[PDB]
Design a protein around this ligand. Structure first.
Ligand SMILES: CCCCCCCCCCCC(=O)OC[C@H](COP(=O)(O)OCC[N+](C)(C)C)OC(=O)CCCCCCCCCCC
Ligand SMILES: CCCCCCCCCCCC(=O)OC[C@H](COP(=O)(O)OCC[N+](C)(C)C)OC(=O)CCCCCCCCCCC
Ligand SMILES: CCCCCCCCCCCC(=O)OC[C@H](COP(=O)(O)OCC[N+](C)(C)C)OC(=O)CCCCCCCCCCC
Ligand SMILES: CCCCCCCCCCCC(=O)OC[C@H](COP(=O)(O)OCC[N+](C)(C)C)OC(=O)CCCCCCCCCCC
Ligand SMILES: CCCCCCCCCCCC(=O)OC[C@H](COP(=O)(O)OCC[N+](C)(C)C)OC(=O)CCCCCCCCCCC
Ligand SMILES: CCCCCCCCCCCC(=O)OC[C@H](COP(=O)(O)OCC[N+](C)(C)C)OC(=O)CCCCCCCCCCC
Ligand SMILES: CCCCCCCCCCCC(=O)OC[C@H](COP(=O)(O)OCC[N+](C)(C)C)OC(=O)CCCCCCCCCCC
Ligand SMILES: CCCCCCCCCCCC(=O)OC[C@H](COP(=O)(O)OCC[N+](C)(C)C)OC(=O)CCCCCCCCCCC
Ligand SMILES: CCCCCCCCCC(=O)OC[C@H](COP(=O)(O)OCC[N+](C)(C)C)OC(=O)CCCCCCCCC
Ligand SMILES: CCCCCCCCCC(=O)OC[C@H](COP(=O)(O)OCC[N+](C)(C)C)OC(=O)CCCCCCCCC
Ligand SMILES: CCCCCCCCCC(=O)OC[C@H](COP(=O)(O)OCC[N+](C)(C)C)OC(=O)CCCCCCCCC
Ligand SMILES: CCCCCCCCCC(=O)OC[C@H](COP(=O)(O)OCC[N+](C)(C)C)OC(=O)CCCCCCCCC
Ligand SMILES: CCCCCCCCCC(=O)OC[C@H](COP(=O)(O)OCC[N+](C)(C)C)OC(=O)CCCCCCCCC
Ligand SMILES: CCCCCCCCCC(=O)OC[C@H](COP(=O)(O)OCC[N+](C)(C)C)OC(=O)CCCCCCCCC
Ligand SMILES: CCCCCC(=O)OC[C@H](COP(=O)(O)OCC[N+](C)(C)C)OC(=O)CCCCC
Ligand SMILES: CCCCCC(=O)OC[C@H](COP(=O)(O)OCC[N+](C)(C)C)OC(=O)CCCCC
Ligand SMILES: OCCCC(F)(F)F
Ligand SMILES: [Cu+2]
Ligand SMILES: [Cu+2]
Ligand SMILES: [Cu+2]
Ligand SMILES: [Cu+2]
Ligand SMILES: [Cu+2]
Lengths: 382, 241, 236, 120, 153, 77
């Protein structure tokens, strides 16, 4: 819900999310929904964004309407920040547990230490039930099971109320007598030395000694109880395992790319060379969370968000099968209302008019090839 | 003027209550702005309440307003609760926002978004000022105590959140699991300025070293803000702006 | 008569209006208020921004102009009883200023935190940006200017010169509003981390410190209270 | 400059000048220069890349001592929301102009001193 | 590569620079690489002779709006006009205040008693006119420069 | 003599020394003792430690009780 405002070229060339899947579209309270997919770190990472040396796999959502039970990059849990390598493809998996009823737009996002949020596609997930039914149990290494919704809440309230009461007692003790104007007049007109006299000093000594003694006793008691404590666990985690993708058998060279101002379409001319031994066909163009599909070649079945999915938004001038070894140049047009709804047309406002995306090529048997394209995007006005 | 001695007393009492309201809530606004924009992130999150950065920063930036308000109230009225009123106002504003916005508007649990405790430090600062009225003695000893007692004062609250948990193959504290589970879309984990370990971290010294550094810097900041409050008390009439 | 029930209204108007504002933002925070380019955002928060800015400008102009036009020309021939009554009215103005300062600089400011640190962020005019920067800030600025003008135009102590502590207390917190420019320049460009303790937050803070001039302002009001009707009793 | 001078002469308050006139001084800078630089921002398709006329000027007219990376210009951020770059910068400049004007009023007050430092 | 580029240590790159002669003479032309945090890395330099006249140099370019301009003098007239106009406005303000005596009598008037005599109507009216005209002219010029050149990047 | 105080996890994941050898255990004044071995830079280098872009091969010892005549990484001084 935080994208459509970021720069179009920055959304195009940071991170490409694909193979996204959602386990469920509608859940109950305490029910789990799993989000899977892959993201590729673009080679032409913008210089204004710091390299993803420190990155965190986050969830885009309006507060804890879900709780993040687990999150994985590769196959290993990532509760801390992680290091990503430019040009590598990683697979991710986020497990969410429903907490608050309603209709929520859930995004998978990557926060980069020096570049800000990179928001992936968002999907509407319905939560039904009552928040009062939500439980977040956890078992500690000390052998006790607690609910994270209310654990330590009573202790926190008690201690804060106790110290607030001590301070209020001090202030009220000094506030029983007249406060401002008579004391000001006494201090000004001659030496005061009358508004602070025993047993006021004795009361202050008692307050100070009691404060120190209570702090020490409370710390000792909180050490006898909970004798086993550990510091906060933090630190960027290295050695994220990237996907070992096979080398693509399709090479694509972008010969100019244009978009009409104003308009809802993007046009580019591609020289596609088919290696390997199977006839390929262009089935998809993904630019920034928007999938332009050639419906005659490929159809989406993973429940991709409709406002981000162009079922027939990809038109190829000659999308006949490309025989192996054969090279041809075609005009590819990606047109959909999403191009203007998600403000991908506002790249005219950007200080770097370059686009990047993913082309998905499909053969007859159905196996697909992913190739990455990037080129300057030239607006056309007449 | 005033009719009699009794009516003068009643008028003075009414003025006392109204001026106490004005002082308290102007201090609440200004002190809360300063605190939340100088220590707010650590104060917001239990998984930010660490032993190095939280313990270091919070007393240093929070001794500011108590020093100024003390330098005014004690000097002009012999009222030894400037630090206490500052800390109480900050705690009231923080708790109101935590309950009605952090837990009310958004639905973060209170055990996740509770603020830190500061009344022990405030009481030390006020009593050390009233006894031995020396502002220099206060800045040296009371600010030392204010810095040193911060972490022990908050330990009863945060200690239960530091129980170790075996969470999906990784060791995590309860506060760590809170920060992991309750998603902060705008607050990724790397923003967390917490103790991460160094090659020059010798033994079990992280909390005491941070506490002593905070106490020394609190001495310095109290010394500066005593004179800042001295200036802010000026009753001058700048003839023209 | 002396202190009248204008203090009750001063507290209640801010309390009720800001409770309604909190209800409004609780209802329209999500669901017309998350997406800054949705049409419903324009009808529920951009319209709110426009209406509140126009109403704040009109109210400030009317209130300040009325207070300045009804200024007391013959301050010399003011009885001590009337001076005491005017001092109490000025104290009510200061109470309203303190209440507005609380609502602006504590409640809605830390609501900026809860909001920016949990939402995916989107424009310079998030609903928290409409409520805090452009409603509560302006409201407390108007109240502070009105209190200063009332002191200058009804209290002989605060006449015959501009009080430096009052001017600081009134203008410094006002400088937080133009400091919002540093905020916008302080997230869009410098600092994409939603840190609230970032140096781009210093302009507000620095100018939050100037509210400490309330101490000098209040000792000035105490002296103004204790001019003719200082007692006796006090120091007797 | 005209805004700063007129806002000072009218309402002789230096504080009012520092607040309002400096605000205007900061805000009117870019609109004042827009008639000059607007023709230089016409887009051009230059050898496969999109470039403004000013960009082509900087590219063509070689500055041996001034490479392109030294250029501290807007490059885009992930927190740049919508079409706000110029107004946000203008308002930040206006606020900082208020601050700098306030400081330099007193700096000039000092520089006006007519004191006779008896010995150096 | 009209912008800065990223190079990898240990890699070999091939380059090609196209230069168009502009100024007659004998020039030592170097190919160089400027590094962000290290300064200039100057390659071999070669003497290249340029003959002709600078007045014959042209730098045409065609915009996406369908107009061909010469970069040598494009927008020069507009820049000169606007700068001269604003300089004239400032000079007019200063001269308006400079028709009367300037320094010593005004200093004496300000020092000896309240001045309140050297700034009187219609001086305030002239200043209000200057301020309003400045703001209005800036707004109108911006609007006109937006109607013309409606497409900018 | 300066370890046993550093963090255990930082000592575990920075640099692993193995195949260490010492030419002699007891030496005379002016006599040479050579220390050889291998070290592996751990892939999971902690983020709190800067990457070893600038590193120095040093000797842990109580002042110049020995003088470093030579030091090699790979085969070069
Ligand atoms: C009433 C007077 C008599 C008491 C005197 C107390 C002397 C010190 C006690 C040390 C406790 C302990 O145990 O050592 C220190 C404990 C940790 O201990 P460890 O983990 O075992 O450290 C392992 C190494 N050792 C075995 C050598 C200790 O924490 C600390 O690092 C505290 C460090 C504080 C640094 C800043 C101090 C500034 C002082 C300013 C004065 C105005
Ligand atoms: C005017 C002076 C008033 C001083 C009041 C002191 C009250 C008692 C505190 C016990 C602390 C403790 O138990 O040990 C140190 C622990 C930190 O331990 P940790 O190793 O980080 O582990 C944390 C987990 N625990 C708690 C299960 C072990 O707490 C602190 O960070 C406090 C540091 C400041 C100590 C100040 C006393 C030293 C002399 C001061 C005068 C120069
Ligand atoms: C002029 C100033 C004089 C002050 C004298 C010191 C009074 C100490 C009171 C007891 C504190 C205590 O016992 O607790 C302090 C704890 C010890 O922590 P620990 O050893 O890690 O573990 C907990 C072990 N317990 C449970 C057995 C305590 O926190 C610290 O690490 C702080 C220790 C550094 C103290 C530096 C003092 C330097 C003084 C220099 C004088 C010239
Ligand atoms: C210092 C001078 C301050 C000046 C600024 C004041 C701002 C006022 C609010 C702006 C509203 C806006 O702009 O929005 C207009 C809103 C948009 O809601 P709607 O879509 O019509 O839904 C139906 C309306 N509900 C959602 C509120 C039910 O509707 C309105 O007409 C209602 C606005 C009521 C404001 C007055 C009540 C305040 C509480 C009572 C104690 C005073
Ligand atoms: C106390 C101060 C009160 C000031 C009230 C505001 C007066 C505005 C005059 C018209 C300006 C205009 O219309 O132009 C401003 C342009 C709009 O730009 P645009 O929308 O991107 O595109 C151009 C669209 N046009 C061609 C339709 C204009 O620049 C800006 O972005 C700046 C807008 C931010 C204004 C912030 C004001 C906050 C006031 C808070 C009061 C409590
Ligand atoms: C007379 C005295 C007045 C001087 C003030 C003028 C404003 C300075 C403008 C800086 C531009 C510059 O110098 O460079 C701009 C640099 C270039 O960095 P980058 O490579 O784009 O980094 C990329 C990182 N992003 C993507 C996050 C940008 O961005 C900066 O680091 C901004 C540093 C902050 C400086 C502003 C501090 C204002 C203080 C406010 C406290 C009240
Ligand atoms: C006379 C009184 C009534 C007028 C009140 C004006 C209110 C604001 C108008 C916004 C114009 C607009 O259109 O929005 C803002 C335009 C860009 O617009 P966009 O590209 O559509 O932004 C897309 C997102 N949206 C649809 C939600 C707008 O520029 C800006 O980001 C300006 C940002 C300025 C930040 C600093 C302001 C400091 C103010 C200090 C006060 C003392
Ligand atoms: C005392 C107050 C005087 C204010 C005088 C304003 C004159 C009109 C300016 C129109 C600007 C415009 O047209 O919109 C905004 C544009 C930038 O637009 P851009 O999106 O970056 O694109 C650039 C390309 N253009 C021009 C083809 C779209 O210009 C600016 O950067 C001006 C920003 C400051 C606006 C100040 C007015 C808001 C209220 C101020 C009081 C709080
Ligand atoms: C050389 C530095 C060593 C430390 C001394 C610094 C204190 C100096 C403060 C000062 O200037 O004097 C203010 C008061 C004066 O009160 P007196 O009327 O002198 O009271 C004397 C009786 N008394 C011992 C109970 C205090 O006297 C006091 O401040 C209190 C004196 C008692 C010392 C303990 C008080 C501090 C408690 C934490
Ligand atoms: C952020 C920093 C904190 C701000 C505190 C700085 C205050 C500086 C003191 C000051 O303003 O001096 C006022 C003089 C004008 O003097 P006059 O108007 O002649 O007043 C006569 C008595 N007096 C000279 C002692 C003032 O100088 C002038 O020219 C008048 C300017 C007054 C502006 C002060 C208002 C500050 C609000 C932010
Ligand atoms: C919706 C806005 C309603 C605002 C109503 C403003 C009321 C008019 C202000 C005013 O002049 O005084 C109202 C009261 C009572 O003081 P008055 O005595 O009426 O003021 C003049 C003093 N004089 C009679 C001796 C000449 O003085 C007060 O204490 C009134 C405090 C009101 C709180 C401030 C509200 C501002 C919200 C922006
Ligand atoms: C925006 C930032 C403010 C900058 C701070 C500068 C003002 C600080 C000093 C100050 O408030 O004094 C101005 C007068 C107080 O009386 P004086 O300054 O003695 O002069 C009275 C004659 N005058 C009304 C034309 C100024 O106070 C008034 O007369 C104000 C009431 C009249 C204005 C009402 C019209 C405004 C509608 C928007
Ligand atoms: C509470 C803050 C609200 C804003 C008020 C701040 C202005 C305060 C400036 C000040 O201290 O007073 C200086 C002059 C005094 O001249 P006066 O002899 O009072 O002239 C009154 C007739 N007049 C309305 C045409 C001005 O009076 C003026 O400065 C001009 C007053 C007219 C306001 C508009 C002038 C500013 C134009 C941009
Ligand atoms: C970059 C910072 C800007 C520089 C401004 C700093 C000026 C400091 C004021 C100053 O210089 O004080 C002079 C005194 C010597 O006093 P005397 O020669 O006894 O003069 C008697 C009258 N007086 C005491 C008020 C000066 O102190 C002395 O010992 C004489 C030193 C005079 C050096 C000032 C020349 C500054 C040129 C850069
Ligand atoms: C001193 C500041 C008081 C702030 C209290 C506040 O924000 O109240 C809103 C909150 C809203 O939660 P709730 O009461 O459950 O009502 C929800 C209504 N909305 C969602 C519109 C806020 O609770 C109340 O309305 C209690 C009334 C307190 C009167 C001083
Ligand atoms: C009064 C203390 C001010 C200290 C300033 C500070 O902490 O700045 C941190 C920042 C370091 O940037 P960093 O924290 O790494 O920011 C990471 C996020 N990005 C890269 C988007 C800015 O340094 C600067 O850019 C210069 C600040 C000048 C202050 C007048
Ligand atoms: O002023 C908004 C709070 C912090 C930010 F990260 F969102 F920018
Ligand atoms: Cu969304
Ligand atoms: Cu990619
Ligand atoms: Cu901010
Ligand atoms: Cu050893
Ligand atoms: Cu190893």
């Amino acid at each position: 819900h935080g994208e459509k405002s970021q720069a179009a070229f920055m959304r195009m060339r940071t991170i490409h999310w694909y193979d996204l899947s959602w386990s469920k579209e509608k859940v109950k309270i305490n029910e789990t929904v799993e989000i899977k997919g892959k993201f590729h770190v673009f080679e032409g990472w913008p210089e204004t964004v710091d390299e993803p040396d420190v990155a965190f796999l986050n969830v885009g959502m309006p507060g804890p309407v879900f709780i993040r039970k687990e999150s994985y990059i590769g196959g290993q849990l990532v509760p801390r920040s992680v290091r990503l390598e430019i040009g590598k493809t990683y697979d991710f998996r986020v497990v969410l547990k429903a907490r608050r009823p309603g209709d929520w737009h859930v995004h998978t996002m990557m926060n980069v230490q020096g570049g800000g949020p990179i928001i992936g596609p968002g999907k509407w997930i319905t939560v039904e039930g009552s928040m009062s039914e939500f439980r977040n149990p956890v078992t500690t290494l000390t052998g006790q099971t607690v609910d994270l919704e209310n654990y330590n809440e009573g202790n926190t309230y008690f201690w804060h109320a106790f110290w607030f009461a001590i301070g209020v007692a001090w202030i009220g003790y000094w506030s029983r007598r007249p406060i401002f104007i008579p004391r000001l007049l006494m201090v000004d007109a001659g030496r005061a030395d009358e508004l602070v006299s025993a047993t006021d000093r004795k009361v202050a000594m008692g307050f100070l000694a009691a404060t120190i003694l209570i702090v020490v006793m409370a710390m000792s008691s909180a050490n006898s109880k909970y004798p086993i404590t550990i510091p906060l666990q933090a630190g960027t985690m290295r050695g994220m395992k990237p996907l070992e993708l096979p080398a693509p058998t399709v090479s694509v060279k972008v010969e100019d790319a244009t978009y009409r101002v104003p308009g809802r379409a993007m046009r580019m001319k591609l020289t596609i060379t088919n290696h390997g031994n199977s006839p390929i066909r262009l089935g998809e163009f993904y630019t920034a969370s928007v999938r332009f599909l050639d419906s005659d070649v490929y159809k989406d079945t993973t429940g991709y968000p409709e406002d981000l999915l162009a079922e027939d938004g990809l038109s190829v001038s000659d999308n006949s099968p490309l025989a192996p070894g054969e090279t041809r140049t075609v005009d590819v047009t990606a047109s959909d209302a999403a191009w203007e709804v998600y403000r991908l047309s506002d790249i005219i406002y950007d200080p770097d008019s370059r686009f990047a995306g993913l082309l998905f090529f499909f053969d007859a048997t159905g196996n697909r090839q992913v190739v990455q394209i990037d080129a300057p995007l030239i607006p056309s006005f007449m | 003027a005033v009719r009699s001695h009794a009516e003068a007393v009643q008028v003075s009492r009414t003025i006392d209550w109204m001026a106490l309201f004005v002082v308290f809530f102007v201090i609440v606004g200004s002190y809360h702005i300063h605190a939340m924009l100088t220590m707010g992130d650590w104060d917001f999150w239990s998984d930010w309440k660490d032993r190095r950065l939280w313990v270091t920063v919070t007393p240093i930036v929070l001794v500011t307003f108590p020093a100024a308000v003390q330098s005014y109230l004690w000097e002009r009225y012999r009222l030894p609760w400037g630090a206490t009123v500052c800390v109480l106002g900050l705690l009231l504003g923080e708790w109101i926002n935590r309950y009605f916005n952090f837990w009310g508007w958004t639905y973060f649990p209170i055990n996740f978004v509770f603020p830190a405790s500061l009344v022990p430090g405030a009481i030390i600062l006020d009593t050390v000022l009233m006894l031995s009225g020396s502002y220099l003695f206060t800045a040296i000893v009371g600010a030392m105590g204010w810095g040193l007692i911060f972490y022990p004062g908050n330990w009863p609250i945060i200690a239960p959140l530091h129980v170790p948990v075996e969470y999906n193959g990784m060791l995590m504290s309860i506060a760590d699991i809170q920060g992991y589970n309750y998603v902060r879309t705008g607050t990724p984990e790397y923003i967390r300025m917490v103790e991460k370990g160094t090659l020059r971290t010798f033994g079990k010294d992280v909390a005491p070293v941070s506490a002593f550094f905070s106490a020394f810097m609190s001495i310095l900041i109290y010394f500066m803000w005593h004179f800042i409050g001295r200036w802010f008390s000026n009753e001058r009439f700048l003839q023209s702006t | 008569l002396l202190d009248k029930k204008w203090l009750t209204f001063a507290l209640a108007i801010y309390t009720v209006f800001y409770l309604w504002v909190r209800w409004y933002e609780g209802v329209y925070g999500w669901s017309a208020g998350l997406d800054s380019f949705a049409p419903e955002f324009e009808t529920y928060w951009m319209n709110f921004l426009y209406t509140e800015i126009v109403l704040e400008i009109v109210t400030a102009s009317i209130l300040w102009g009325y207070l300045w036009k009804t200024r007391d020309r013959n301050l010399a021939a003011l009885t001590p009883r009337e001076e005491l009554r005017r001092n109490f009215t000025h104290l009510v103005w200061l109470v309203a200023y303190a209440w507005a300062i609380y609502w602006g600089a504590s409640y809605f400011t830390e609501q900026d935190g809860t909001w920016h640190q949990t939402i995916v962020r989107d424009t310079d005019f998030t609903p928290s940006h409409i409520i805090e920067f452009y409603l509560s800030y302006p409201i407390y600025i108007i109240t502070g200017f009105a209190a200063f003008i009332y002191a200058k135009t009804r209290l002989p102590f605060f006449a015959k010169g501009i009080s430096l502590p009052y001017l600081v207390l009134v203008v410094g917190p006002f400088m937080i509003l133009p400091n919002v420019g540093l905020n916008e320049w302080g997230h869009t460009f410098w600092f994409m981390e939603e840190l609230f303790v970032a140096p781009l937050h210093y302009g507000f803070v620095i100018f939050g410190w100037l509210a400490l001039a309330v101490m000098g302002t209040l000792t000035q009001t105490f002296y103004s209270f204790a001019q003719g009707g200082l007692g006796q009793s006090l120091c007797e």
